Design a protein around this motif. Structure first.
Motif, PDB file in Angstrom:
ATOM      1  N   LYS C 111       0.962  -1.187  -0.032  1.00 36.24           N
ATOM      2  CA  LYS C 111      -0.125  -0.026  -0.134  1.00 36.24           C
ATOM      3  C   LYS C 111       0.968   1.270  -0.130  1.00 36.24           C
ATOM      4  O   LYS C 111       0.514   2.298  -0.237  1.00 36.24           O
ATOM      5  CB  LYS C 111      -1.013  -0.083   1.191  1.00 36.24           C
ATOM      6  CG  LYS C 111      -0.247  -0.226   2.437  1.00 36.24           C
ATOM      7  CD  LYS C 111      -1.091  -0.040   3.599  1.00 36.24           C
ATOM      8  CE  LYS C 111      -1.913   1.206   3.897  1.00 36.24           C
ATOM      9  NZ  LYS C 111      -2.997   1.278   5.005  1.00 36.24           N
ATOM     10  N   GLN C 112       1.965   1.117   0.199  1.00 31.30           N
ATOM     11  CA  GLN C 112       2.970   2.322   0.256  1.00 31.30           C
ATOM     12  C   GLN C 112       4.616   1.795  -0.090  1.00 31.30           C
ATOM     13  O   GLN C 112       4.947   1.078   0.389  1.00 31.30           O
ATOM     14  CB  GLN C 112       2.987   3.160   1.345  1.00 31.30           C
ATOM     15  CG  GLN C 112       3.607   4.498   1.335  1.00 31.30           C
ATOM     16  CD  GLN C 112       3.517   5.261   2.810  1.00 31.30           C
ATOM     17  OE1 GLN C 112       2.617   4.944   3.433  1.00 31.30           O
ATOM     18  NE2 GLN C 112       4.704   5.966   2.864  1.00 31.30           N
TER      19      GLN C 112
ATOM     20  N   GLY F  38     -10.474   3.386  -1.614  1.00 23.15           N
ATOM     21  CA  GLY F  38     -11.541   4.477  -1.497  1.00 23.15           C
ATOM     22  C   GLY F  38     -10.923   6.065  -1.887  1.00 23.15           C
ATOM     23  O   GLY F  38     -10.452   6.168  -3.100  1.00 23.15           O
ATOM     24  N   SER F  39     -10.843   6.702  -0.800  1.00 22.97           N
ATOM     25  CA  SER F  39     -10.091   7.980  -1.090  1.00 22.97           C
ATOM     26  C   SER F  39      -8.686   7.841  -0.966  1.00 22.97           C
ATOM     27  O   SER F  39      -7.829   8.554  -1.332  1.00 22.97           O
ATOM     28  CB  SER F  39     -10.482   8.988   0.151  1.00 22.97           C
ATOM     29  OG  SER F  39     -12.117   9.228  -0.076  1.00 22.97           O
ATOM     30  N   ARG F  40      -8.361   6.576  -0.139  1.00 21.73           N
ATOM     31  CA  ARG F  40      -6.799   6.162  -0.032  1.00 21.73           C
ATOM     32  C   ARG F  40      -6.648   4.821  -0.199  1.00 21.73           C
ATOM     33  O   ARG F  40      -7.900   4.028  -0.579  1.00 21.73           O
ATOM     34  CB  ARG F  40      -6.321   6.536   1.430  1.00 21.73           C
ATOM     35  CG  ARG F  40      -6.077   8.050   1.482  1.00 21.73           C
ATOM     36  CD  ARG F  40      -5.639   8.357   3.012  1.00 21.73           C
ATOM     37  NE  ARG F  40      -5.106   9.536   3.078  1.00 21.73           N
ATOM     38  CZ  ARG F  40      -5.997  10.837   3.148  1.00 21.73           C
ATOM     39  NH1 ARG F  40      -7.150  10.762   3.275  1.00 21.73           N
ATOM     40  NH2 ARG F  40      -5.358  11.954   3.237  1.00 21.73           N
ATOM     41  N   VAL F  41      -5.804   4.008   0.141  1.00 18.63           N
ATOM     42  CA  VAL F  41      -5.334   2.575  -0.120  1.00 18.63           C
ATOM     43  C   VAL F  41      -5.717   2.159   1.312  1.00 18.63           C
ATOM     44  O   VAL F  41      -4.995   2.613   2.625  1.00 18.63           O
ATOM     45  CB  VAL F  41      -4.094   2.128  -0.611  1.00 18.63           C
ATOM     46  CG1 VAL F  41      -3.926   0.718  -0.711  1.00 18.63           C
ATOM     47  CG2 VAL F  41      -3.830   2.835  -1.758  1.00 18.63           C
TER      48      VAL F  41
ATOM     49  N   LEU G  18     -12.756   8.679   7.802  1.00 20.23           N
ATOM     50  CA  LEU G  18     -13.667   7.723   7.499  1.00 20.23           C
ATOM     51  C   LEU G  18     -12.875   7.059   6.291  1.00 20.23           C
ATOM     52  O   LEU G  18     -12.598   7.762   5.517  1.00 20.23           O
ATOM     53  CB  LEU G  18     -14.997   7.829   7.246  1.00 20.23           C
ATOM     54  CG  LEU G  18     -15.831   8.467   8.581  1.00 20.23           C
ATOM     55  CD1 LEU G  18     -17.467   8.055   8.387  1.00 20.23           C
ATOM     56  CD2 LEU G  18     -15.571   7.116   9.666  1.00 20.23           C
ATOM     57  N   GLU G  19     -12.622   5.648   6.376  1.00 21.65           N
ATOM     58  CA  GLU G  19     -12.379   4.828   5.004  1.00 21.65           C
ATOM     59  C   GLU G  19     -13.348   4.931   4.119  1.00 21.65           C
ATOM     60  O   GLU G  19     -14.470   4.095   4.074  1.00 21.65           O
ATOM     61  CB  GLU G  19     -12.179   3.471   5.532  1.00 21.65           C
ATOM     62  CG  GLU G  19     -10.871   3.597   6.348  1.00 21.65           C
ATOM     63  CD  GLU G  19     -10.303   2.085   6.476  1.00 21.65           C
ATOM     64  OE1 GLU G  19     -10.929   1.048   6.878  1.00 21.65           O
ATOM     65  OE2 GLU G  19      -8.933   1.946   6.566  1.00 21.65           O
ATOM     66  N   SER G  20     -13.684   5.918   3.192  1.00 23.55           N
ATOM     67  CA  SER G  20     -14.805   6.253   2.450  1.00 23.55           C
ATOM     68  C   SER G  20     -14.360   5.614   0.870  1.00 23.55           C
ATOM     69  O   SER G  20     -13.528   5.550   0.537  1.00 23.55           O
ATOM     70  CB  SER G  20     -15.421   7.681   2.250  1.00 23.55           C
ATOM     71  OG  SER G  20     -13.950   8.270   1.644  1.00 23.55           O
ATOM     72  N   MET G  21     -15.514   5.007   0.330  1.00 20.38           N
ATOM     73  CA  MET G  21     -15.390   4.573  -1.135  1.00 20.38           C
ATOM     74  C   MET G  21     -15.471   5.726  -1.934  1.00 20.38           C
ATOM     75  O   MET G  21     -15.454   6.851  -1.614  1.00 20.38           O
ATOM     76  CB  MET G  21     -16.495   3.545  -1.518  1.00 20.38           C
ATOM     77  CG  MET G  21     -16.251   2.334  -0.279  1.00 20.38           C
ATOM     78  SD  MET G  21     -14.668   1.507  -0.478  1.00 20.38           S
ATOM     79  CE  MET G  21     -15.191  -0.315  -0.441  1.00 20.38           C
TER      80      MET G  21
END
Lengths: 174, 275, 117, 54, 174, 117, 117, 117, 117, 55
Positions: C111-112, F38-41, G18-21
């Protein structure tokens, strides 16, 4: 540069075996039928030759091709030290494949050839050819030191002549 | 006899109610012998001293150990060892859940606070914190809560002031980092062979190069940072140094420095009303 | 070096250098920029990306296939022969591993990735 | 042996359910290698534990 | 290693036939026009030669190439034992194809050649060439025993000099 | 062996070794890990997988095609020439079997494979 | 930035991002204008509106579902990647939360949102 | 785990784990909050909700359809692959069960679910 | 069988097996449970249900369409390929039968179905 | 053995595999001797419970 690559390959070969090989010298040409007679063969020995180059991936690099010629003596129809010859060939392949010598990058083993025919066998010489290929980049035509640095950048904004001038005297460095 | 018969297990936290010099000297000797790189069995001791403010201040100034934390209380209806046991239990659970979270508002269940006139004022609590004595607080109801837990370490070796080894979080984090590094090294590299940097070993052989240990330490540092224990990565990478020993020939020497993350303690505000 | 270009790449997992074939890929973790047009061209837009390392391993080597298919939390190091190095931490083995004629394909993913050294 | 049972034989072969009531609220003896603590304290008379033994 | 592969192939050939073949010996070079005159032919017999190598799948392995030269005698224009020659060829193909000899893996039959021409027929010799190819991996330049083990890992955490040190002396093994 | 790599593979069904062609595949049964952004990994996500063995058999051999198309509960053994062995139990013949110019393709499949020996 | 457009959005509840999609919605709180026609077209008419934030969260994350279904008085922050930020105060979790194949949908709603920063 | 996300879910009824298809839903039991507007926006309003578990079961399995259509007082356990577990007690089978091409849909429902473990 | 799942289904009317297409439905006869909420969640409530069998038949087959549209008192047997069997007695043909491009849809319905064998 | 374990008769597989031994007979030359050990699964018989009421 090719001289640096040749020197690095010769040094690596010399340090790989040391006292086992009688001599390690460069060669002119690849190999001819009269080389077995015109050369100072001291078996066992290793000869290095530069077999031209080819079209590289860029215009600043070329794909050089090299070759190693191990020479061994056969007496009464039998090699003097067959395990020694095999070990020499294997160590030469394993000590050059993948390593970088000078500016050259990633020597690749193309093929190994058996060059023992009537001409070499009738002279009591066992010859094997180990061929490599690497990436040799070309140098630059103009050296940096010939030209001087870019230190000052002076810009004047255009205005009518009889007006207070606007300009910037910029020191590029510092 | 009791300190000699403890055993060889790793007791992470120790409860000592006897607050006297002859016993505390032996406890300090044993703990500092365990704290060293030889034994590697880290241990901490939690004590509570009951008495007047002057006596508590004198005791805190007298003791200068970085492995014992004492909390002072005056006019406690209950005996001191009950407070010590409750505080040690709460601190042990909280630090086992997370070694970096401060102990700022945790409450002690079932412990009666002293009278209103026997509680320390702000100045007394601040002086006690500057004197190496931990302080507590009384909740809005009748609950007693931890205020800040610090060690007895106050003075540098030459006699100057030293803020290192002060918070219990520092010791807990250091112990956790040592344990994690030991586990990672003993797991990823059970039994290997050492070779100098720059040697040509090639694929297949199970040898280890100082660059390999460098990369593994960098990966472990990434895991630590993601876990919320260390903050700065570039400085840690630039200060790393892995090398072989020129005498042992079987010992690898590494010198690393981590940047332990900070804790949110003081919130200073200024209000400028317009009326 | 002075004029040396990248000819080969080395991949090391938990300190063990992998017997990798020719043509090893590497995709750094960062932001993928797209293209935005409506009535005109306006700009770009971002999207997160994950680091990937791809290679092939001959069968029957020192490292078994059962070990390969069980990598969940490993350290992957991608180093070029010139000296450029990238480190992947807490990586994992993605996609379907197959042994096709002695060839095992690895899709080691993380992931990085940061460029060390 | 984690749970100390009283009046329940260790060699029972009748297939059934055995239920016991005990007022004392014991704590599960699950090992916690990372949370081992030690306590020092005095013991009065009528004690059944040998001194200086954990 | 090549010597181990050659020894394994020779041993397999010897145990496959035993007393049927008069001799099983290695060969220098592949085959020349003067080999029918300079060699001690004892038909039936089998000669093994190493015809170089090639580029392998990795840089730690190469694709070696071998060859078997069965020699048979023809008398008055006819082979001495034609079914015997055919059986020898078939058994040689079936006893080497797919098996592993030393470090070499999976010998592959490339092709079988008929080498009976004027030179060999005029000398009363029937010659067939059976060519194989396997996977020979290269050895390592540096042996394990030269370097010593990694037993101790000592780490010291950086702190101000006049503070109690924090360090870990870790025994990698045991 | 010491340096021996996998060059050939042997497949045995109910004890009968199959006349397999070059390039035999093998996919172990396990968990296939996907990628989540999503917004990140954020991480990976699992998915079950089934063991597969693929090969080709010449026509007219000892084992008939009617036998091949009737395998519902068989034992499949995949062994490499170096010594690595995998066992597939209660396997079955999947996909469409075709005899294309003397070539019969087998897609022998099972729900779980463990590495024995 | 100079030409940067919004590609991703970040949602933070009580400081926890938040872990957003992909595809997160946002409806500002304001006045919804309708259309009025009789014999001709006369004008518009207003109607109050409430701020809404919609996203999806993978299952098994740091934040449990029981915490999600118990949000009555929380602070929600909607920030675009370019730098636009909106703050929702005293928000609450509306509609039915469902865990459909590892996907949890959040309908975080508030009665007023103002654009801070 | 450290970065593991939910990829699959397991449903167990009375201890028997169900052969569930992909995409299993789960709605926790709690309070559904609505939206209230008059002349302005005022707040929310509650409404009770019931726990639901949805999945699909292949036909011809160990558990018969007659058993499925006769579940009035059962224990349903919903567990994610990461480790999140929810328990439904005194649940029942709701809606119409249908066997559509070997697919049986379960709408197992309960009046209260709590997150155990 | 041991691991066999339902792949196809057979429908037989008065002993004649029907030429059925893929995707044949089956709804057992039983009790449909609803959901009851007032101020809280209280429980469920029942409702009778009737057995249904749905399939498609190609046109021009042995069984004519006039026979299909005249089934008032017939015996319908639904059998899965694994071995599960359900019997519908005194069934009838419901809904509108249509011949759409050689496809005839059957909605064979009965008031009670029991699982025989 | 895998079929037996799936059927619900034996529990441990690794131990069974490690204790297996198949060999030929050096006298009969037509008899194969095998020595195997299965781990028969346990049965749920005794349920011991202890209740600690608080009242």
């Amino acid at each position: 540069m090719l001289e640096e690559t040749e020197a690095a390959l010769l040094a690596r070969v010399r340090e790989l075996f040391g006292a086992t090989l009688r001599q390690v010298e460069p060669l002119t040409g690849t190999w001819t039928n009269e080389d077995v007679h015109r050369l100072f063969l001291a078996p066992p020995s290793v000869f290095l030759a530069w077999m031209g180059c080819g079209e590289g991936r860029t215009r600043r690099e070329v794909e050089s091709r090299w070759a190693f010629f191990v020479v061994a003596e056969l007496l009464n129809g039998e090699p003097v030290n067959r395990p020694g010859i095999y070990q020499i060939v294997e160590r030469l392949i394993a000590g050059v494949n993948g390593q970088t010598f000078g500016p050259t990058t990633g020597m690749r083993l193309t093929q190994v050839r058996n060059l023992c025919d009537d001409n070499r066998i009738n002279a009591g010489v066992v010859l094997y050819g180990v061929l490599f290929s690497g990436t040799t980049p070309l140098p630059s035509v103009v050296d940096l030191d010939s030209l001087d640095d870019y230190e000052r950048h002076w810009q004047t904004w255009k205005f009518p002549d009889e007006t207070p001038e606007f300009a910037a005297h910029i020191n590029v460095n510092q | 006899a009791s300190i000699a018969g403890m055993g060889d297990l790793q007791y992470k936290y120790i409860v000592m109610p006897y607050t006297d010099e002859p016993n505390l000297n032996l406890l300090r000797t044993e703990l500092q012998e365990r704290w060293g790189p030889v034994n590697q069995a880290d241990g901490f001791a939690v004590t509570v001293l009951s008495g007047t403010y002057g006596d508590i201040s004198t005791f805190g100034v007298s003791r200068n150990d970085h492995l014992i934390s004492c909390m002072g209380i005056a006019g406690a209806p209950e005996p001191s060892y009950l407070y010590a046991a409750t505080l040690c239990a709460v601190a042990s659970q909280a630090l086992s859940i997370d070694p970096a979270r401060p102990l700022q508002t945790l409450t002690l269940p079932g412990r009666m606070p002293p009278a209103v006139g026997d509680r320390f004022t702000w100045s007394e609590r601040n002086a006690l914190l500057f004197d190496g004595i931990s302080t507590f607080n009384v909740n809005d109801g009748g609950e007693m809560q931890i205020e800040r837990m610090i060690t007895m370490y106050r003075t540098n070796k030459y006699g100057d002031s030293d803020p290192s080894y002060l918070n219990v979080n520092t010791i807990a984090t250091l112990s956790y980092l040592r344990y994690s590094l030991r586990t990672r090294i003993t797991q990823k590299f059970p039994n290997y062979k050492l070779a100098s940097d720059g040697t040509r070993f090639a694929t297949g052989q199970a040898v280890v190069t100082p660059s390999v240990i460098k990369t593994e330490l960098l990966a472990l540092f990434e895991e630590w940072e993601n876990a919320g224990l260390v903050e700065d990565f570039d400085t840690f990478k630039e200060e790393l140094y892995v090398a072989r020993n020129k005498d042992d020939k079987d010992r690898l020497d590494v010198l690393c420095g981590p940047n332990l993350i900070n804790q949110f303690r003081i919130f200073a505000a200024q209000v400028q009303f317009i009326l | 070096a002075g004029n040396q270009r990248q000819g080969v790449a080395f991949i090391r997992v938990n300190g063990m250098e992998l017997e990798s074939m020719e043509g090893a890929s590497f995709t750094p973790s960062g932001i993928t920029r797209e293209e935005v047009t409506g009535s005109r061209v306006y700009g770009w837009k971002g999207k997160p990306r994950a680091a990937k390392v791809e290679c092939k391993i001959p069968g029957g080597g020192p490292i078994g296939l059962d070990e390969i298919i069980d990598w969940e939390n490993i350290t992957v190091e991608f180093q070029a022969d010139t000296g450029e190095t990238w480190m992947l931490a807490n990586a994992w083995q993605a996609d379907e591993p197959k042994n096709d004629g002695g060839e095992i394909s690895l899709v080691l993913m993380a992931k990085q990735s940061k460029r060390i050294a | 042996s984690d749970i100390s049972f009283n009046a329940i034989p260790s060699d029972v072969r009748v297939p059934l359910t055995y239920i016991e009531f005990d007022n004392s609220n014991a704590v599960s003896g699950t090992p916690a290698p990372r949370q081992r603590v030690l306590m020092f304290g005095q013991s009065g008379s009528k004690a059944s534990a040998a001194p200086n033994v954990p």
